[PDB]
Amino acid sequence: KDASKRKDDVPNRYDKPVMGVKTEKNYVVANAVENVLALPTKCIPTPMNRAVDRA
């Protein structure tokens, strides 16, 4: 006699997942503050150290 269970049972109509998650924030103020605190960066090569500066 086969007694295997291959397929899971269907969900109930009331079973619902957690959904509709929203974060609350003022994007204008947050973006302005992030732009104020930003650190500068450069894509040029870093200045090379001379051979004489060895300890």
């Binding site: 899971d8 079973d15 997942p17 957690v18 509709g20 998650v21 929203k22 204008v28 973006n31």
Partner: protein, 430 residues
Amino acid sequence: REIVCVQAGQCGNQIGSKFWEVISDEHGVDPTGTYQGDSDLQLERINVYFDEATGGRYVPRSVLIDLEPGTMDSVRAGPYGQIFRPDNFIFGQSGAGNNWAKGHYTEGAELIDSVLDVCCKEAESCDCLQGFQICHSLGGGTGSGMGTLLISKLREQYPDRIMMTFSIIPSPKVSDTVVEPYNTTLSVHQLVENSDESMCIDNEALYDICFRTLKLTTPTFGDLNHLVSAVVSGVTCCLRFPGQLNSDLRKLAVNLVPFPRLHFFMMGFAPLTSRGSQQYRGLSVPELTQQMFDAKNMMQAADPRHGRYLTASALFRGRMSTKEVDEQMLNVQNKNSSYFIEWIPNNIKSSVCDIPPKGLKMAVTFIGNNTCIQEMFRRVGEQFTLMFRRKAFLHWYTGEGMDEMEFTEAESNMNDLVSEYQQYQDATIE
């Protein structure tokens, strides 16, 4: 300044085939690969899209990827298919099954190393590399999963270059597949973090362009892919021909994106008119300017009348006066002040290029950054919430291995993108 192209999925490979036909025509390259052009202006920038193979031949710098080889035999069988390098075709054995998780996790990780090897082979050959250009649909399976995977890997390896995507998104009216909302939501979550600039196209907008403007009796997917190939080849024209006011993809990004998440744009191409009408209207800058802002000529379902323009760009091709361009953009800016975001004093950038596409006296391509794009994402989220509340087809994705929390992540990220656009729409000077 070289561009590398990536073509993914059936839609991407077909649009790519039409794009390389348009580019080969504009530079006078025979389908055997031999140069047969008639002016040095064609030859002097051929390097931008083609590499030179031995004894005259040119090969196009493009990578073709797909999960089932059915399309690859079709593109090799096409009229220009021979030009493509055989080693540049990458394919699997089993299909994507229209499933994002399968395309991203099981067959994606199997092929991704070979596509990155080909992309690195193409990138490291350039003397100076400009951004990548990718065409794919978001509703499919291998297009969405492997396109976003490859975009993530290329964004890790080349963060200082430009990342450009052309993307097809499912119509709310004519879907070919039931599980479109899941694939679209996960893909937009990946794109909003990874991309620098993204263009979105609705097939419904291309059908409305063909039927109302071109009055085609029996349009086919080849016509839609021809319109897309036309705009794609138009955006790069100032990179590869002389002009009175040069422009560049980086200059477009700097003028169009105010904040890094607001990088989704609308598209249009102006000189479109039916063969019966063509005898009745000569080309001129006022005609192009009136058509470029007409919503009939825009390639998305969202309409500008429900939003506001943050920024816009116009690239003109042809022998024409700069005074008419400047005065047209001034007149539209002064006369239409309600459609422009008020805390930016001038929203339109113009550019002029001397060389038009063959057989046309003049052309313009229009790129627009408008908040009405939020309406498309909200609509996709509605169809997702209808399907997700009831776990309608979730067992396929969970069987591949996804935790339900990924779906809540994608919903939260799309909702935050819609919220950010809505907040900047209703901002004020105070």
